[PDB]
Design a binder for this molecule. Structure first.
Ligand code: B6H
Length: 342
């Protein structure tokens, strides 16, 4: 009947109450989100005199230990002096309150899915998409810092927020499924829509999985719809294949999960298993973006900064981010020097 003296519910979450004052400091206002980790709440900080987003972790060993790993990575990112760390959400501080670990973040505007929902899933401009692409590449360059080497491992429109509703500044959020580079513990990783072929194929992986995710995300910001919207791993891969063609043979020969999607024929070549989909490599990114047809759905026709020249620079940058090989896939440093950002 009673859970944590009545402060928790039946599934270990703290009972969020509007107007409750925590430690004579944090004035709780309203619930923002609830995940598996727990809940996140909007609260006003009285000593700092500013709004904050308090992430309230569940009263559970499994979710507490995971949030401690997140704290360790957030605080390790704060240690570095550079300016490019400000494209990640600032963990201000953490504390224990009535048996719940509470992470205090800076208060932010909406997520990028809410931005796409405001467009009725028709997308934002190539001018705005360039601004997010640069800042996300700057964020991924920060994560690639050798002493950090952090893989976010779950980049999607919901995990990218806007700083202010008027300003066009974005910041990457939720490092709950994040670990530093190393030996492989986890295979089923990333959100399916933004999941890399090396992850789908059961191959080794590294920082490059976040760039694949970025590539997908940036097309979705300008088109409005997800690029590869698979209902399962098979459907995911078939949608990747119909845009980028069949993965290269040398990758598929090494891949332990290659036989889930593809089939090695008697001649030695690889091909899709039977299951609807267009032939491999036929739904060109050129036509999805609308390089010559005035943008996606003809909606950017005659709008400034949406020329054939500007769309080809964007198409080229995206194809480098969506390289099948994670070794030749473009890195944050070279991405930031792409002609799309000139
Ligand atoms: C489902 C899991 C989830 O949302 N996790 C999560 C929750 C909160 C945060 C987080 O740190 C946030 S969320 C946030 N602002 C914010 C973002 C989106 C929203 N939404 C989300 C839902 N939407 C329908 C209404 C607008 C509300 C927010 O607070 C006003 N600021 C921070 N600092 C990061 C991740």
């Amino acid at each position: 009947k009673v859970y944590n003296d009545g402060y928790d519910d039946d599934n270990y979450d703290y009972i969020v109450k509007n107007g409750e004052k925590w430690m004579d400091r944090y004035e709780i206002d309203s619930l923002i989100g609830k995940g598996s980790f727990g809940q996140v709440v909007k609260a006003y900080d009285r000593v700092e005199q500013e709004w904050v987003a308090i992430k309230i972790i569940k009263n559970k060993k499994a979710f507490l230990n995971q949030a401690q790993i997140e704290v360790r990575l957030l605080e390790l990112m704060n240690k570095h002096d550079t300016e490019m760390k400000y494209y990640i959400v600032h963990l201000k501080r953490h504390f224990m309150f009535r048996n719940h670990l509470c992470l205090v973040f800076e208060m932010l505007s909406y997520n990028l899915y809410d931005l796409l929902r405001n467009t009725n899933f028709r997308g934002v401009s190539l001018n705005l998409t360039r601004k997010f692409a640069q800042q996300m590449c700057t964020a991924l360059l920060f994560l690639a810092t050798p002493e950090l080497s952090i893989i976010h491992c779950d980049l999607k429109p919901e995990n990218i927020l806007l700083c202010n509703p008027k300003r066009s500044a974005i910041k990457i959020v939720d490092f709950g499924s994040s670990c530093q580079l190393g030996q492989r513990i986890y295979q089923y990783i990333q959100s399916r829509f933004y999941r890399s072929p090396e992850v789908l194929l059961g191959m080794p992986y590294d920082l490059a999985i976040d760039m694949w995710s970025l590539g997908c995300i940036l097309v979705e910001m300008h088109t409005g719809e997800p690029l590869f919207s698979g209902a399962n791993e098979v459907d995911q891969m078939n949608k990747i294949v119909e845009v980028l063609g069949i993965p290269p043979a040398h990758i598929l020969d090494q891949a332990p999960k290659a036989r889930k999607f593809f089939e090695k024929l008697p001649d030695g070549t690889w091909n899709l298993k039977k299951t609807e989909y267009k032939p491999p490599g036929t739904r060109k990114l050129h036509n999805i973006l609308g390089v010559e047809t005035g943008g996606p759905g003809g909606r950017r026709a005659g709008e400034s900064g949406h020329t054939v020249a500007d769309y080809l620079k964007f198409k080229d940058l995206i194809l480098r981010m969506l390289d099948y090989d994670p070794k030749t896939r473009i890195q944050p440093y070279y991405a930031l020097q792409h002609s799309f950002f000139k």
